[model samples]
Target: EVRLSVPPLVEVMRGKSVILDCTPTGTHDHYMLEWFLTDRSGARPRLASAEMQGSELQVTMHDTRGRSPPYQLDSQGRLVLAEAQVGDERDYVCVVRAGAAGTAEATARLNVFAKPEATEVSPNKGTLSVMEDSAQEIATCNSRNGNPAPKITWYRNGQRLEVPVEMNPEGYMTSRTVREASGLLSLTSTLYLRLRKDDRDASFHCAAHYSLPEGRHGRLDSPTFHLTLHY
Candidate 1:
């Protein structure tokens, strides 16, 4: 019996390279080896294949996409993906056929991540204008073009602001998400404020927070702006 050995999961950041090693073990000599990429709907796309022909080893790649495929197969049956993209996140399977021995296959999930391109915090109407104690939408924080989206955090005077347990009449935050045609995400967070005379000249900012490889974190900050209070 032959068994295919593969990793269960592989995580990499966008534009990076990753290798998915597949090896056949147990009792058979591999005659042919192929790699397939499967999507959510279970449609498998043939990537590449390698076969032993007498004393020569022949490798053939299937160009499913219009351009050259971003995958490569080395001499040791390892699949290498150079410069991965967000859409490359999927299940990769390596299948080995040993002719009379048997067929064996294993799958590994690929997770590709990307951080937001930039962050911006700005007043909705050029500048803030407060009228006594009435609440108004002061500004909006935008984090653009991120894969898997980014979390936005509001800061006032360099301190984090929390969404109150209940409806906070004094101030609150609202956020929305938009998906771009490129499959990236854009997130916007609005800040509403009910200001008093004591809130003059308060600085506000927003940060975009996301994850990277190896349990790391990433953050992008916008330029701070101070309130131009009009009482």
Candidate 2:
């Protein structure tokens, strides 16, 4: 019978690795075991196999990655990925059957974590020439290609702004998402502020933080911009 070491849920950060170990619990004169990756692609990609060779396990592994072999069936019968890629996220299974032991199979899911990329906070250039008493200009915080939509924060001279961030955060409180081809989301937030006289020291930027794996953290920021208010 097939038994798995990794469970129903496991998470690995991007570029990291994972191992799904399995073993046949019952003993028989002759044994055969197989490992499979079942996911997005229609094919149930076979990754490796095992059979009793003497008192030891005889094995053969396959490379699923197009360029080269990215996985290995270790001596202990565990599926090993030296460096996990985004596509590695999926359900993994073990199928075991022996000469006397009946067939058994089990499955587990692997999740890969990634941070946000390609972020920008664009200020409306046309509105930059503002009269001290006029309405404040506009700036949009745009972050794209993130696994999970990123957090948006407005900053003035490095301090977090008192103005509230939109209620949806990633969607229509002046925020929204443009669905991406890869299933990830792009974030956009609109900000409004009034240009005031004698506030020449004012500057603005946006910061984006990600929900990274435990024990890790990351932050991205827009290029600093100095507001030019006309007297």
Candidate 3:
């Protein structure tokens, strides 16, 4: 069976790099190896398709593109990923094509990280005061400090609420003020509702989420942000 070993988890900022390593055990005589990638649809997409001269291969990923080249084994059967990205995070399969015999396969999961940063929240930080009986209320949360832009989510008194949010190409929300280069991944959620004077002291929260390889999540709260509503 072919198996891969890597860090239990990794947390990377946007435009960063990561490496993955794969190792095979058992058979070691005249075998060819191939690498494959799968999308969210579970389709086996070819990433680096090369014949192994011995028992080692190396794959490299930079930017959004992924590339793999064939190599001879180094006594020990192993594969390495020189660099990785969010797009590279997916299901991977390694196949060993041996002469005469059919082939052997193994699988692994990848996780990518891209969280949004909360730059600023309007209405000040500690206390929120609003005039009684207002027509419409608007609260803005900004993630300018986050790189690649950060997504926005809203919550009410610790409970998540639906909100209409917009994101820019860089991954930052369009409606909020404040601007700084963000490294967090970007996603958006919005909430809209009719309000009454009695709804003055409700609490709301915002969160962000990023993608990561399987079995490597739970490192940090990709999503961040919480707010209180006062009317």
The clash count of every prediction, one per candidate, is 0, 3, 36
The lowest-lDDT stretch of 10 consecutive residues in candidate 2 is 164-173
- Show model 2 residue runs off by greater than 4 Å: 1-5, 27-30, 40-43, 61-69, 117-119, 129-137, 142-149, 157-201, 215-217
Error of 3 at 31 (Å): 0.5
Off by over 4 Å in 3: 1-19, 40-43, 49-79, 100-102, 122-135, 143-185, 188-231
Encode model 3's per-residue lDDT on 51-102: one tens digit a residue: 4554554433222342433222232334344344444556666676666555
Tell me how candidate 1 scores on lDDT: 0.79
Residue 26 local lDDT, model 1:
64
User: Which regions of candidate 1 fall more than 4 Å away from where they truly are?
Assistant: 67-69, 125-127, 164-168
Candidate with the larger lDDT of 1 and 2:
1
- Alpha-carbon RMSD, each predicted model: 2.5, 4.7, 8.9
Clash count for candidate 1 is 0
Which pairs of residues collide in candidate 1? none
The order by descending lDDT is 1, 2, 3
- lDDT assessment of candidate 2: 0.69
Superposed Cα RMSD, model 3: 8.9
TM-score of each: 0.87, 0.69, 0.48
